[PDB]
Coordinates of C-alpha atoms in Angstrom, one line a residue:
Chain A
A1 CA -158.0 -46.1 -163.2
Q2 CA -158.9 -47.3 -159.8
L3 CA -155.8 -47.4 -157.4
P4 CA -154.3 -51.6 -156.7
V5 CA -154.6 -53.2 -153.3
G6 CA -154.0 -56.0 -151.7
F7 CA -154.5 -59.6 -152.6
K8 CA -155.8 -61.6 -150.7
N9 CA -153.2 -64.8 -150.2
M10 CA -154.2 -67.5 -147.7
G11 CA -151.1 -69.0 -147.9
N12 CA -148.5 -70.9 -150.5
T13 CA -150.8 -68.6 -152.6
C14 CA -148.1 -65.7 -152.8
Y15 CA -146.5 -67.1 -156.1
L16 CA -149.7 -66.9 -157.5
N17 CA -150.9 -63.6 -156.1
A18 CA -147.7 -61.9 -157.9
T19 CA -148.5 -63.2 -161.2
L20 CA -151.9 -61.3 -162.1
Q21 CA -151.5 -59.4 -160.9
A22 CA -148.9 -58.4 -162.9
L23 CA -150.8 -59.9 -166.2
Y24 CA -153.9 -56.6 -165.4
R25 CA -151.7 -53.7 -165.4
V26 CA -150.9 -54.3 -169.1
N27 CA -153.7 -51.7 -170.3
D28 CA -155.1 -54.0 -173.7
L29 CA -154.5 -57.0 -171.2
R30 CA -157.2 -56.3 -169.0
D31 CA -160.0 -54.5 -170.8
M32 CA -159.8 -57.9 -173.5
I33 CA -160.9 -60.0 -170.8
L34 CA -162.8 -56.7 -169.3
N35 CA -164.9 -58.2 -172.5
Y36 CA -164.7 -62.2 -172.7
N37 CA -167.9 -63.1 -172.5
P38 CA -169.0 -66.6 -173.3
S39 CA -171.4 -65.9 -176.4
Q40 CA -167.9 -65.0 -177.9
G41 CA -166.4 -68.7 -177.0
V42 CA -162.9 -70.2 -178.3
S43 CA -160.8 -69.0 -181.5
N44 CA -160.2 -72.2 -181.3
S45 CA -161.1 -75.8 -181.4
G46 CA -157.9 -77.2 -181.6
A47 CA -157.7 -78.7 -177.7
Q48 CA -159.5 -81.2 -175.7
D49 CA -159.4 -79.0 -172.9
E50 CA -161.5 -75.8 -174.4
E51 CA -164.5 -75.5 -172.0
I52 CA -161.1 -75.5 -168.7
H53 CA -160.0 -72.8 -170.6
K54 CA -162.4 -71.2 -171.2
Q55 CA -163.4 -71.3 -167.3
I56 CA -159.5 -70.2 -166.1
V57 CA -160.3 -67.0 -168.6
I58 CA -164.1 -66.2 -166.4
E59 CA -162.1 -66.0 -162.4
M60 CA -159.4 -63.6 -163.2
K61 CA -162.3 -61.2 -164.7
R62 CA -163.3 -61.3 -160.9
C63 CA -160.0 -60.6 -159.8
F64 CA -159.4 -57.8 -161.9
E65 CA -162.3 -56.1 -161.8
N66 CA -161.9 -56.0 -157.6
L67 CA -158.4 -55.5 -157.8
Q68 CA -158.6 -52.1 -159.5
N69 CA -161.5 -51.6 -157.0
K70 CA -160.4 -50.3 -153.7
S71 CA -163.0 -51.6 -151.7
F72 CA -162.7 -55.4 -152.0
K73 CA -159.1 -56.3 -151.2
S74 CA -160.9 -59.7 -151.7
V75 CA -160.2 -61.4 -154.9
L76 CA -161.4 -65.4 -153.5
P77 CA -158.4 -67.6 -155.0
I78 CA -160.0 -70.5 -153.6
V79 CA -161.8 -71.6 -156.9
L80 CA -159.5 -69.9 -159.2
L81 CA -157.1 -72.3 -157.6
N82 CA -159.4 -75.7 -157.9
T83 CA -159.4 -75.2 -161.9
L84 CA -156.0 -74.5 -162.0
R85 CA -155.2 -78.4 -160.6
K86 CA -157.9 -79.5 -163.4
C87 CA -156.6 -78.1 -166.3
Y88 CA -153.1 -78.8 -165.6
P89 CA -151.6 -81.8 -163.4
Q90 CA -148.5 -79.1 -162.8
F91 CA -150.3 -77.7 -160.2
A92 CA -151.9 -81.3 -158.8
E93 CA -148.6 -82.2 -157.1
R94 CA -146.5 -81.1 -154.6
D95 CA -148.4 -82.0 -150.4
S96 CA -149.7 -78.8 -149.0
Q97 CA -152.2 -77.9 -146.0
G98 CA -155.8 -78.1 -147.1
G99 CA -155.4 -78.8 -151.0
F100 CA -152.5 -80.2 -152.4
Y101 CA -150.8 -77.1 -154.0
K102 CA -147.9 -75.3 -152.3
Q103 CA -145.1 -72.6 -153.4
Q104 CA -144.0 -73.1 -157.6
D105 CA -141.8 -71.8 -159.5
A106 CA -143.8 -68.6 -161.2
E107 CA -142.0 -69.1 -164.9
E108 CA -144.7 -73.1 -164.8
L109 CA -147.5 -70.8 -163.5
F110 CA -146.6 -68.0 -166.0
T111 CA -146.1 -70.5 -169.5
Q112 CA -149.7 -71.7 -169.0
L113 CA -151.5 -68.9 -167.8
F114 CA -149.9 -67.9 -171.8
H115 CA -151.9 -71.0 -173.3
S116 CA -155.1 -70.2 -171.7
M117 CA -155.4 -67.0 -172.7
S118 CA -153.8 -68.0 -176.3
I119 CA -156.7 -70.6 -177.3
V120 CA -159.6 -68.5 -175.7
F121 CA -158.6 -65.6 -178.3
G122 CA -156.7 -67.3 -180.9
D123 CA -153.8 -65.3 -182.9
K124 CA -154.6 -62.2 -181.4
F125 CA -152.9 -63.1 -178.2
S126 CA -150.2 -64.5 -179.9
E127 CA -149.2 -61.9 -182.5
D128 CA -148.4 -59.8 -179.4
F129 CA -146.1 -62.3 -177.5
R130 CA -144.4 -63.5 -180.8
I131 CA -140.4 -62.7 -181.8
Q132 CA -138.9 -63.7 -185.0
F133 CA -135.2 -64.1 -185.2
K134 CA -132.6 -64.3 -187.9
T135 CA -130.5 -67.4 -186.0
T136 CA -127.1 -68.3 -187.4
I137 CA -125.7 -71.3 -186.2
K138 CA -122.1 -71.8 -186.3
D139 CA -120.3 -74.1 -185.3
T140 CA -117.1 -72.6 -183.9
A141 CA -114.9 -75.0 -185.2
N142 CA -116.3 -75.1 -188.7
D143 CA -117.5 -71.5 -188.6
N144 CA -117.2 -72.6 -192.7
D145 CA -120.2 -74.6 -192.0
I146 CA -123.3 -71.5 -191.4
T147 CA -126.9 -72.8 -191.4
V148 CA -129.0 -70.1 -191.8
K149 CA -133.3 -70.5 -189.6
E150 CA -135.6 -67.4 -190.2
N151 CA -138.8 -69.1 -189.7
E152 CA -136.5 -69.3 -186.4
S153 CA -140.2 -67.9 -183.7
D154 CA -140.5 -67.9 -180.0
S155 CA -143.7 -66.3 -177.9
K156 CA -140.3 -65.5 -175.1
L157 CA -136.8 -64.9 -174.8
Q158 CA -134.8 -66.4 -171.1
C159 CA -131.9 -64.1 -170.8
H160 CA -129.4 -65.8 -169.2
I161 CA -127.2 -64.8 -166.6
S162 CA -125.2 -67.7 -166.1
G163 CA -121.2 -67.1 -167.4
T164 CA -120.0 -63.8 -166.6
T165 CA -122.9 -61.4 -165.9
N166 CA -123.0 -58.2 -163.6
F167 CA -126.7 -56.8 -165.2
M168 CA -129.5 -57.6 -166.2
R169 CA -128.2 -55.4 -169.5
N170 CA -124.8 -57.8 -169.6
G171 CA -127.5 -60.5 -169.9
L172 CA -129.9 -60.1 -172.3
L173 CA -126.3 -60.7 -174.8
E174 CA -125.6 -63.9 -173.4
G175 CA -128.9 -65.4 -173.7
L176 CA -128.7 -64.9 -177.3
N177 CA -125.7 -66.8 -177.4
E178 CA -127.6 -70.4 -176.2
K179 CA -124.8 -73.6 -177.0
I180 CA -126.3 -76.7 -178.3
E181 CA -124.2 -78.8 -179.9
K182 CA -125.5 -81.7 -183.0
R183 CA -125.0 -85.6 -183.1
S184 CA -124.6 -84.4 -186.8
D185 CA -120.9 -84.4 -188.3
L186 CA -122.0 -83.2 -191.6
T187 CA -123.2 -80.2 -189.6
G188 CA -119.1 -80.4 -188.3
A189 CA -118.4 -81.6 -186.0
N190 CA -120.4 -82.4 -182.0
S191 CA -118.0 -79.3 -180.8
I192 CA -120.8 -76.4 -179.0
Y193 CA -122.6 -74.4 -181.8
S194 CA -122.3 -70.7 -181.7
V195 CA -126.5 -69.8 -182.0
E196 CA -126.8 -65.9 -182.6
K197 CA -129.8 -64.3 -182.7
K198 CA -130.9 -61.2 -184.1
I199 CA -134.4 -59.8 -183.0
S200 CA -136.3 -59.0 -186.4
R201 CA -139.4 -59.0 -185.5
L202 CA -140.6 -57.2 -181.7
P203 CA -143.8 -57.8 -180.1
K204 CA -145.8 -55.6 -178.6
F205 CA -145.3 -56.5 -175.1
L206 CA -142.4 -58.3 -174.1
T207 CA -141.3 -61.3 -171.5
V208 CA -138.4 -61.5 -170.1
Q209 CA -137.6 -65.1 -168.3
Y210 CA -135.0 -65.6 -165.9
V211 CA -133.2 -68.9 -166.5
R212 CA -130.7 -70.0 -164.0
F213 CA -132.9 -72.3 -161.4
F214 CA -130.4 -75.5 -161.1
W215 CA -128.9 -78.2 -160.0
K216 CA -125.8 -76.8 -158.2
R217 CA -124.0 -79.9 -158.2
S218 CA -120.9 -80.0 -156.4
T219 CA -123.3 -79.4 -153.1
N220 CA -126.0 -81.1 -154.1
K221 CA -128.8 -78.5 -154.0
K222 CA -131.3 -77.0 -155.4
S223 CA -129.4 -73.2 -155.9
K224 CA -129.7 -70.3 -158.8
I225 CA -127.5 -68.6 -160.0
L226 CA -126.7 -66.1 -157.3
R227 CA -124.7 -64.0 -159.9
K228 CA -125.4 -60.0 -159.8
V229 CA -128.0 -58.5 -162.0
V230 CA -129.0 -54.8 -162.0
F231 CA -132.5 -54.0 -164.0
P232 CA -133.3 -49.7 -165.1
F233 CA -136.3 -48.2 -165.3
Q234 CA -135.3 -47.9 -168.9
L235 CA -134.7 -50.5 -171.6
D236 CA -133.9 -50.5 -174.5
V237 CA -132.7 -52.4 -177.3
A238 CA -132.0 -50.8 -180.0
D239 CA -128.4 -53.2 -180.3
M240 CA -130.2 -56.0 -180.1
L241 CA -132.2 -55.0 -183.3
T242 CA -131.0 -55.7 -186.7
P243 CA -129.7 -52.8 -189.0
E244 CA -132.7 -53.0 -191.1
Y245 CA -135.8 -52.9 -188.1
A246 CA -134.5 -50.3 -186.4
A247 CA -134.5 -47.5 -188.1
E248 CA -138.3 -47.4 -188.6
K249 CA -138.6 -47.6 -184.9
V250 CA -136.4 -44.6 -184.2
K251 CA -138.4 -42.8 -186.9
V252 CA -142.3 -43.8 -185.3
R253 CA -140.4 -43.1 -181.8
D254 CA -140.4 -39.0 -182.0
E255 CA -144.8 -38.9 -182.5
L256 CA -144.4 -40.0 -179.8
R257 CA -142.4 -38.1 -178.1
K258 CA -145.1 -34.7 -178.2
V259 CA -147.2 -37.0 -176.3
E260 CA -145.5 -37.4 -173.2
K261 CA -144.9 -33.4 -173.5
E262 CA -148.7 -33.1 -173.3
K263 CA -148.9 -35.4 -171.6
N264 CA -146.7 -34.6 -168.1
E265 CA -147.7 -30.3 -168.8
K266 CA -151.0 -30.9 -167.8
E267 CA -150.2 -33.0 -165.4
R268 CA -148.0 -30.5 -163.3
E269 CA -151.6 -28.3 -163.4
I270 CA -153.3 -30.6 -161.1
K271 CA -150.4 -30.6 -158.1
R272 CA -151.6 -27.1 -157.7
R273 CA -154.9 -26.8 -158.0
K274 CA -154.6 -29.1 -154.4
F275 CA -152.4 -27.9 -153.0
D276 CA -154.1 -24.6 -152.2
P277 CA -157.3 -25.0 -150.2
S278 CA -161.7 -25.0 -151.5
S279 CA -161.8 -21.3 -150.1
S280 CA -165.1 -20.2 -149.6
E281 CA -168.1 -22.7 -150.4
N282 CA -169.0 -23.1 -147.5
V283 CA -169.2 -25.9 -144.1
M284 CA -167.6 -28.3 -147.2
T285 CA -164.1 -30.4 -146.0
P286 CA -161.7 -29.7 -149.0
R287 CA -161.9 -33.5 -149.1
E288 CA -165.0 -33.4 -151.4
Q289 CA -163.2 -31.2 -153.5
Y290 CA -160.0 -33.1 -153.5
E291 CA -161.2 -36.5 -154.7
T292 CA -163.5 -34.7 -157.7
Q293 CA -159.7 -34.1 -158.9
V294 CA -158.6 -37.8 -158.4
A295 CA -161.2 -38.8 -160.8
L296 CA -160.3 -36.1 -163.7
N297 CA -156.1 -37.6 -163.9
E298 CA -157.2 -41.0 -164.0
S299 CA -159.7 -40.3 -167.1
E300 CA -156.4 -37.7 -168.1
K301 CA -154.5 -40.4 -168.5
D302 CA -155.8 -43.2 -170.2
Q303 CA -157.5 -40.5 -172.5
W304 CA -153.3 -39.3 -173.7
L305 CA -153.0 -43.4 -174.5
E306 CA -154.9 -43.7 -177.0
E307 CA -153.5 -41.2 -178.6
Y308 CA -150.4 -42.2 -179.0
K309 CA -151.8 -45.4 -180.6
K310 CA -154.0 -43.5 -183.7
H311 CA -150.7 -41.4 -184.1
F312 CA -149.1 -44.7 -185.4
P313 CA -148.2 -45.0 -188.5
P314 CA -151.4 -47.6 -191.0
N315 CA -148.1 -49.0 -192.0
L316 CA -148.3 -50.2 -188.4
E317 CA -149.2 -53.9 -187.9
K318 CA -150.5 -55.7 -185.3
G319 CA -147.8 -57.4 -183.1
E320 CA -145.9 -54.6 -183.9
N321 CA -144.3 -52.5 -180.8
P322 CA -144.0 -48.7 -182.1
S323 CA -140.5 -48.5 -180.8
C324 CA -137.1 -49.8 -179.8
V325 CA -138.3 -48.5 -175.4
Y326 CA -140.4 -50.4 -173.1
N327 CA -141.3 -49.0 -170.0
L328 CA -141.4 -51.6 -166.7
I329 CA -144.6 -52.2 -165.3
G330 CA -144.1 -54.9 -163.7
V331 CA -141.8 -57.8 -161.5
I332 CA -142.1 -60.2 -160.0
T333 CA -139.7 -60.6 -157.8
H334 CA -138.3 -64.4 -156.0
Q335 CA -136.8 -64.3 -153.4
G336 CA -134.5 -67.8 -151.5
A337 CA -133.2 -70.4 -153.4
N338 CA -135.9 -73.4 -153.2
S339 CA -139.1 -72.6 -154.8
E340 CA -140.4 -76.1 -153.3
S341 CA -141.2 -72.8 -149.9
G342 CA -139.8 -69.6 -151.2
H343 CA -141.5 -66.6 -150.7
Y344 CA -143.1 -64.8 -154.6
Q345 CA -143.5 -60.4 -154.3
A346 CA -144.1 -58.2 -156.4
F347 CA -143.9 -54.1 -157.4
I348 CA -146.1 -53.3 -159.9
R349 CA -146.4 -50.0 -161.0
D350 CA -149.0 -47.6 -160.2
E351 CA -151.1 -46.3 -162.0
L352 CA -152.4 -42.5 -161.3
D353 CA -149.0 -41.7 -161.1
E354 CA -146.4 -43.7 -163.3
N355 CA -143.6 -42.3 -160.9
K356 CA -144.6 -44.3 -158.0
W357 CA -145.0 -48.2 -158.1
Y358 CA -147.1 -49.9 -155.6
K359 CA -145.0 -52.7 -153.4
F360 CA -147.6 -55.8 -152.8
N361 CA -146.1 -57.9 -150.0
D362 CA -149.6 -59.7 -151.0
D363 CA -152.2 -58.4 -149.0
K364 CA -150.1 -55.7 -146.9
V365 CA -149.6 -53.1 -149.0
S366 CA -146.5 -50.4 -148.6
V367 CA -145.2 -47.2 -150.8
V368 CA -141.8 -48.0 -152.8
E369 CA -140.5 -45.5 -155.2
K370 CA -140.1 -46.8 -159.1
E371 CA -136.0 -45.9 -157.7
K372 CA -136.0 -48.0 -154.8
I373 CA -136.9 -50.8 -157.6
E374 CA -133.7 -49.7 -159.4
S375 CA -131.6 -50.1 -156.6
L376 CA -131.5 -53.2 -156.4
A377 CA -127.7 -55.2 -156.3
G378 CA -130.2 -57.7 -157.5
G379 CA -128.5 -61.3 -156.7
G380 CA -129.6 -63.1 -152.8
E381 CA -128.9 -59.8 -151.2
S382 CA -132.2 -58.8 -151.5
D383 CA -134.8 -59.9 -153.6
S384 CA -133.7 -60.7 -157.5
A385 CA -135.8 -60.7 -160.7
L386 CA -137.2 -64.0 -162.3
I387 CA -140.1 -62.5 -164.7
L388 CA -139.7 -58.8 -165.6
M389 CA -142.8 -57.4 -167.2
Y390 CA -142.1 -54.2 -170.7
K391 CA -144.8 -52.2 -172.3
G392 CA -144.4 -50.8 -175.6
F393 CA -144.2 -47.5 -174.7
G394 CA -147.6 -45.5 -174.7
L395 CA -150.6 -48.1 -175.3
Chain B
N1 CA -168.9 10.8 -106.3
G2 CA -171.2 12.2 -103.7
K3 CA -168.6 14.5 -102.2
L4 CA -167.9 15.4 -104.9
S5 CA -170.4 16.9 -107.5
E6 CA -171.9 18.5 -103.8
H7 CA -168.8 20.5 -103.8
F8 CA -169.4 21.4 -107.7
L9 CA -166.1 23.5 -109.3
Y10 CA -167.3 21.3 -112.3
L11 CA -170.0 18.4 -111.8
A12 CA -169.5 16.9 -115.2
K13 CA -165.3 16.5 -116.2
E14 CA -165.3 14.3 -111.9
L15 CA -167.7 12.2 -112.6
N16 CA -166.5 11.1 -115.7
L17 CA -162.8 11.4 -114.9
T18 CA -164.0 9.0 -111.1
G19 CA -165.9 6.8 -113.7
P20 CA -165.0 5.1 -116.4
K21 CA -165.2 7.5 -119.2
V22 CA -161.9 8.9 -118.8
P23 CA -160.5 5.8 -119.6
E24 CA -162.6 5.2 -123.0
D25 CA -161.2 8.8 -124.1
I26 CA -157.0 8.0 -123.6
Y27 CA -157.7 4.7 -126.0
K28 CA -159.4 6.7 -128.3
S29 CA -155.5 8.4 -128.4
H30 CA -153.9 5.9 -128.4
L31 CA -155.3 3.3 -131.4
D32 CA -153.4 6.3 -133.7
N33 CA -150.4 5.3 -133.0
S34 CA -150.6 1.5 -132.6
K35 CA -151.9 1.2 -136.3
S36 CA -155.8 0.7 -136.0
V37 CA -156.1 -2.4 -138.4
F38 CA -159.1 -4.5 -140.8
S39 CA -157.5 -7.3 -140.2
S40 CA -158.7 -10.6 -140.0
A41 CA -157.2 -14.1 -139.9
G42 CA -159.2 -16.9 -140.0
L43 CA -160.0 -19.7 -143.1
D44 CA -162.5 -20.8 -145.3
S45 CA -164.2 -23.7 -145.3
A46 CA -166.5 -26.1 -142.5
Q47 CA -166.3 -25.6 -139.0
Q48 CA -163.0 -23.6 -139.8
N49 CA -165.5 -20.8 -141.7
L50 CA -167.1 -20.1 -138.3
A51 CA -163.8 -19.6 -137.4
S52 CA -162.8 -17.0 -139.4
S53 CA -165.6 -14.6 -138.4
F54 CA -165.1 -15.4 -134.5
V55 CA -162.2 -14.5 -135.4
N56 CA -161.3 -11.3 -136.6
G57 CA -163.5 -10.4 -133.4
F58 CA -160.3 -11.7 -130.9
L59 CA -157.6 -9.8 -133.3
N60 CA -159.5 -6.5 -132.6
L61 CA -158.9 -6.4 -129.2
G62 CA -160.3 -3.4 -127.3
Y63 CA -161.1 -0.2 -129.3
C64 CA -160.0 -0.5 -133.2
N65 CA -162.1 0.9 -136.0
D66 CA -163.0 -2.6 -137.9
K67 CA -166.8 -0.4 -139.3
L68 CA -166.6 -1.4 -143.0
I69 CA -165.8 -5.5 -142.6
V70 CA -168.4 -5.5 -140.0
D71 CA -171.1 -3.4 -142.2
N72 CA -171.1 -6.7 -144.6
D73 CA -173.9 -8.6 -143.3
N74 CA -172.5 -11.4 -145.8
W75 CA -170.3 -12.9 -143.7
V76 CA -172.5 -13.0 -140.9
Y77 CA -175.1 -14.6 -142.7
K78 CA -172.6 -17.4 -143.8
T79 CA -171.9 -18.6 -140.2
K80 CA -173.4 -22.2 -139.7
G81 CA -176.0 -23.0 -137.1
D82 CA -175.0 -21.9 -132.6
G83 CA -171.9 -20.3 -135.0
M84 CA -174.2 -17.4 -136.0
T85 CA -175.0 -16.3 -132.5
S86 CA -171.3 -16.6 -131.1
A87 CA -170.2 -14.3 -134.8
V88 CA -172.4 -11.6 -133.9
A89 CA -171.1 -11.1 -130.0
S90 CA -167.5 -10.9 -131.3
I91 CA -168.1 -7.7 -133.1
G92 CA -168.7 -6.3 -129.6
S93 CA -165.7 -7.7 -128.9
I94 CA -164.1 -4.9 -132.1
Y95 CA -166.4 -2.0 -130.4
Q96 CA -164.9 -3.7 -127.0
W97 CA -164.8 -1.5 -124.0
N98 CA -166.3 1.5 -126.2
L99 CA -170.7 3.0 -127.1
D100 CA -170.2 3.6 -130.5
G101 CA -170.6 0.8 -133.0
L102 CA -173.5 -0.4 -130.9
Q103 CA -175.7 0.8 -134.7
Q104 CA -174.0 -2.9 -136.5
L105 CA -174.9 -4.3 -133.6
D106 CA -178.4 -3.4 -133.0
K107 CA -179.6 -4.2 -136.6
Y108 CA -179.1 -8.0 -135.4
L109 CA -181.4 -6.9 -132.7
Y110 CA -184.2 -7.5 -134.9
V111 CA -184.0 -9.0 -137.7
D112 CA -183.9 -13.3 -138.9
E113 CA -183.0 -16.2 -136.2
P114 CA -183.7 -16.0 -132.8
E115 CA -180.2 -17.0 -132.2
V116 CA -178.9 -13.9 -133.7
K117 CA -181.2 -12.1 -131.1
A118 CA -179.4 -13.9 -128.5
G119 CA -176.3 -12.7 -129.8
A120 CA -176.6 -9.1 -129.8
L121 CA -178.0 -9.3 -126.8
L122 CA -174.5 -10.2 -126.3
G123 CA -172.1 -8.7 -127.8
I124 CA -174.0 -5.3 -126.2
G125 CA -172.5 -6.1 -123.5
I126 CA -169.1 -6.5 -124.0
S127 CA -169.1 -3.4 -126.0
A128 CA -171.8 -1.4 -122.5
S129 CA -168.7 -2.4 -120.4
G130 CA -166.4 0.8 -120.8
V131 CA -169.5 2.7 -118.7
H132 CA -170.7 1.8 -114.7
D133 CA -170.6 4.9 -113.7
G134 CA -170.7 7.1 -116.8
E135 CA -174.3 7.1 -116.7
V136 CA -174.4 7.3 -120.6
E137 CA -176.3 5.0 -122.4
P138 CA -177.0 2.8 -119.6
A139 CA -177.2 -1.6 -120.3
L140 CA -180.1 -2.0 -118.4
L141 CA -182.3 0.9 -121.2
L142 CA -181.1 -2.1 -124.2
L143 CA -181.3 -5.2 -121.8
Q144 CA -184.4 -5.1 -119.6
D145 CA -187.4 -5.6 -122.5
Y146 CA -184.9 -9.0 -123.2
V147 CA -185.4 -10.6 -120.2
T148 CA -189.1 -10.0 -120.3
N149 CA -189.0 -12.1 -123.5
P150 CA -190.3 -16.4 -122.6
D151 CA -187.7 -17.2 -124.9
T152 CA -184.5 -19.1 -123.1
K153 CA -181.7 -18.7 -125.4
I154 CA -182.3 -14.4 -125.9
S155 CA -183.1 -13.8 -122.3
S156 CA -179.6 -15.9 -121.0
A157 CA -177.9 -14.0 -123.1
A158 CA -178.8 -10.7 -122.3
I159 CA -179.1 -11.7 -118.6
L160 CA -176.1 -12.0 -118.4
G161 CA -175.6 -9.2 -120.6
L162 CA -176.1 -6.9 -117.6
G163 CA -173.7 -8.7 -115.5
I164 CA -170.9 -7.7 -117.3
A165 CA -171.8 -3.8 -118.5
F166 CA -172.1 -2.3 -115.1

């Protein structure tokens, strides 16, 4: 709906801002959050910090409603931050002006936020980020030993960009070849294991976390892996998918294609109307006609999304993506190797025109393109992705 | 005139030709060539709604046929405010330098708003300029009566009008 705007900064809350706008732009997630009332309570009484987790969720409600508003660039993150310190001692850390909080790892903030929603909603939030893997564990020296896990799963996928990488795409491959060792020689030596995951069940919403923070031993400093990556606007994951799962996904994708065309047909017919003047209605600015048309458009777009979801087979399970394609909606980029006082920037795909993106440099709004984000060289030459947020097509 | 009129080879042709009546007539011949247009420019809505009306006037400099556009009362009443005043005056500018097209203006002079009455009088000024010594439809005939009406707007248009026409 209404255009996203400045997110109030006040110093040392850059990281914090970026992650919050990021979550908001997911359509489903926004609504569940808006529809959260303390009357429904926590859906898990498995946590001694059950009450605090409700409170976070409510402050994010506040932020989201105001973010959407074109009027309010205030969202008041002063209280939200306070709450975070109590919930988790990670966020009480690091000396700074006023309270004690400073710049942090957006990776740390994201994992912690994740549990907060998970406890309040329960399993509903969770299924929308669960990744199953059929993982084969074969010792490089003892290939003969093969131990198979089928129930291995994780909420989050790691893209390792250490080792030869030049692209995000390459890095997604390397990320499956985690390497672990095992003191047992009943599994065949203390050699590195090739660990090879295929994804056998996609979630509705996919979280990519760049792993790259490490202490560069040789220079005795914090560093981050400097190797080039480039993130294409459209992602396709068809190769990582196990053949059998992949076929179903290609069929589903076709119904989705039809809606995307009717959505872009009636979109063009909007642009024409605005282009022409208002003609006779007499002692009126054109502006009053124009605002009305802007309002139609935002409505029509939410309506089109609902058509994709209804058309999906009732065979499809909640917590599965309909397709093998995803669309980039939010990039949390990081700058500076230190995150002790590095700077976070946010790129958020525009609602009203998916084509357009708003770069939110904290409070300050500037217009950039989808292309500008593609053209990034990544590394340290320019801003480079640390967390990527990917949305199933048509959701 | 009086030297010429005393001799009396012809009274009328000389008076006309000394006077500005022959200057009205030669232009009539010219218009046909340059091509009589109903052309208007200007855009709808807001303060341009006022403009477009006025602008038709300015574009139809001198004596020109734009009779049918003028004949619509729609456009005239569609103007707002003080802009209504300027609309009726500019109809006079279609008919600038010529008596012919008086009739449209006279209509405004009787009907509705104080605003359009002032406008009618100013425009009759602009049109009657094509005389001052023809003494064929004097400005004075129309223009006396509205001085007497004490309403300030009506009188002002009218006594300025006298100044222009003669």
